[PDB]
Write a protein that binds this ligand. Structure first.
Ligand SMILES: CC(=O)N[C@@H]1[C@@H](O)[C@H](O[C@@H]2O[C@H](CO)[C@@H](O)[C@H](O)[C@H]2NC(C)=O)[C@@H](CO)O[C@H]1O
Ligand SMILES: [Ca+2]
Ligand SMILES: [Ca+2]
Ligand SMILES: [Ca+2]
Ligand SMILES: [Cl-]
Ligand SMILES: [Zn+2]
Ligand SMILES: [Zn+2]
Lengths: 403, 403
């Protein structure tokens, strides 16, 4: 394959999601949906009476469902959250202002999302493709928590006053907004709950938001394939525009990212409605893009495989990353995987390489790494692989307490 | 040791919890606390201003924290849940009436509990002894979800009209109340989220909960130790009184329960206050009990070790259970454990034996087992060990879809 494309649809489930999923199915591809369950409650200010139907269709069709928070952080765009808040925020256009405030309350929005999903569809955990408690993406934010060494934030994603185009707008990645700093803490809280978060390389979006039918201007299939060709192995998250979409410290050339392009788009760009004629114009664009991308040598995959699943029989090189049972591991030695030698908290063949900060078992810690343990923070003083006996509060030689 | 005692304290964290924890600490034992976080919000109708202090002390002292639901099901005891609901339910005393109603919303109370704990103590996940998302117990209910074969319900735990100690009360386990049936569905939902749930063998409590001044009728230490002696290997959950505390179909003689006694009591019984002089009378009893139990040969442990952790170097017999990374496994053949060969979804030496009903990999399914998969229910028509390509929707010889 020329590469692997990961289609990711955000902000569903809404009525428009149904035909999107039908087009993916017709095209013989699987995609990943980052959902906001407030649409199931009928308060997300979209056409959403079929939100549940869409959720079931996504899951029955085998697409991956990931977590984008209950309300897309709209509780931080209004004085008091209620049924009108989604519309109130769309009126003021303040989505990107003070988007993140109390990072603990904002991380809790991702759990509330699951409660709601599991309320409207009580059988949802019977679907293996339900990844709501494993994969997430932060609203507005091209931020990543993939492995211990593959992490980076969207340092100008959200603002404390001005929107990115308005005059007087500045962004300093070195000294980011309070909203950004809070979103960074959200990433960390989710990573310690076991989440991976992923941003994107290319945003399939209206090329003109300044007209009354912006959905119509969604990039056509042929040019969009050129954008994808250009993004392949070119570290797109750093060069992407606009500025609030950048991941400034993205680890360019990082092995996990080689020959991959993550596409971001939105279900709501594919309806005939307030943004224009998205269903009539853009459904054919999606069908065509899939057709031509395959013809050009690409394959399509889902974000549960972005970090490849450990596979019996596969040969791994030292330092390669896999996902096993939702946990990221890194190979200690080159070897060939077999049935009884799976990665784990006690394997000598692998170390845990989750993007978490809490002290964790079987992690290769380096001098200078900071870990949390029983409410305190510690520096690692001597490089070592952690084990159950070697807790930071009982190993004052391995760890230096801060703070 | 003569046997292992698991001290378990329910309905905290409250002011009374602090001195309980200090007695445990002075006595040199650890215990397991099944907490209701509504006390942290100040709406639980107990003396509870030191709730967060108690939580922190429990965790800093090495005690295990388990999940007892956010509000002890008080939402099902009132018309509309709010800040006064705890006092309203204490007025009617109707706690054990209609205790469980909508299983989905009742199970969601366990998740809300964790959101609240993780709000008041944002560092809580950095404590290994925080088991809030692994270990639970259902309010009012001596119910068990331990392994695939070790499960049983409290079939008279709660009722649809009369309290168990009122004249005219009847329970038929063969035809359980609606409340009990709903509570069974809550056990099943928690089990599918990866929880184990445990009941108890002996309760340090008044005769029944209808008894006036409950804290003033706890048994003395010496007789209580005698009750623990009698509970050892005697299937107490079947013989225990009163009737609402019984686990009727408890698997007498099940290996995991051998030589163990789980004690239940409540932190609020150790307070000088409305229920009696519980601090003055019962703190000394607890202290004395701990001393004489050790002197008699018992040891004390915590519920995170109730199922024993998998241990490298240990020789296992076919059929033996271990806990590994939060999951229960059962040995396939007698063998000696090696570092790189741990239980997992692909191990040949172990099968997954979580007490869950959703179809799961590497599980030894037996005829008559019913699994959930992608929203549908299937009967296991032929015994086998599940694996990735043997999903119910594609194996109509192994599985039989239900109407
Ligand atoms: C393990 C279990 O669920 N035990 C039950 C007790 O919690 C329960 O007592 C009542 O608990 C409520 C929640 O903490 C209190 O608000 C209430 O005041 C308390 N009642 C009394 C008289 O103290 C009892 C009573 O129904 O039943 C046990 O099964
Ligand atoms: Ca969880
Ligand atoms: Ca994970
Ligand atoms: Ca578990
Ligand atoms: Cl066993
Ligand atoms: Zn979004
Ligand atoms: Zn209780």
């Amino acid at each position: 394959p020329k590469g692997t494309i990961y289609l990711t649809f955000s902000d569903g489930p809404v009525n428009a999601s149904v035909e999107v999923i039908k087009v993916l199915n017709q095209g013989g591809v699987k995609a990943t949906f980052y959902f906001n369950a407030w649409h199931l409650d009928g308060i997300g200010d979209e056409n959403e009476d079929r939100a549940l139907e869409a959720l079931k269709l996504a899951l029955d069709s085998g697409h991956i469902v990931g977590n984008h928070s209950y309300d897309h952080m709209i509780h931080n765009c209004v004085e008091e959250f209620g049924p009108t808040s989604g519309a109130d925020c769309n009126a003021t256009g303040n989505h990107q202002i003070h988007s993140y405030q109390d990072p603990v309350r904002d991380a809790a929005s991702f759990e509330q999302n699951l409660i709601t999903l599991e309320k409207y569809l009580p059988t949802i955990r019977s679907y293996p493709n339900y990844k709501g408690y494993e994969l997430a993406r932060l609203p507005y934010t091209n931020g990543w928590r993939v492995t211990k060494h593959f992490q980076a934030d969207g340092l100008c994603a959200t603002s404390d006053n001005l929107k990115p185009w308005e005059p007087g707008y500045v962004c300093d990645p070195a000294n980011p907004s309070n909203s950004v700093k809070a979103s960074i803490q959200v990433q960390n809280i989710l990573a310690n709950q076991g989440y991976q978060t992923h941003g994107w390389d290319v945003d399939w979006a209206p090329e003109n938001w300044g007209i009354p039918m912006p959905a119509n201007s969604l990039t056509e299939a042929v040019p969009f394939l050129a954008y994808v060709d250009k993004a392949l192995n070119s570290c797109s998250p750093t060069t992407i525009e606009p500025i609030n979409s950048k991941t400034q410290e993205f680890p360019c050339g990082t092995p996990l990212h080689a020959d991959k392009v993550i596409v971001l788009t939105h279900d709501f760009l594919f309806e005939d409605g307030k943004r224009g004629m998205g269903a009539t114009q853009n459904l054919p664009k999606l069908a065509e893009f899939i057709r031509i991308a395959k013809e050009a040598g690409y394959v399509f995959d889902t974000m549960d495989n972005y970090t490849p699943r450990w596979s019996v029989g596969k040969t791994y090189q030292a330092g390669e990353y896999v996902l096993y049972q939702g946990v990221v591991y890194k190979a200690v030695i080159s070897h060939t995987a077999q049935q009884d030698w799976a990665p784990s908290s006690t394997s000598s063949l692998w170390t845990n390489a989750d993007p978490a900060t809490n002290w964790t078992l079987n992690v290769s810690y380096e001098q200078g790494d900071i870990v949390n343990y029983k409410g305190k923070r510690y520096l690692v003083s001597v490089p070592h692989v952690s084990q159950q006996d070697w807790t930071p509060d009982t190993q004052n030689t391995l760890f230096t307490a801060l703070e």
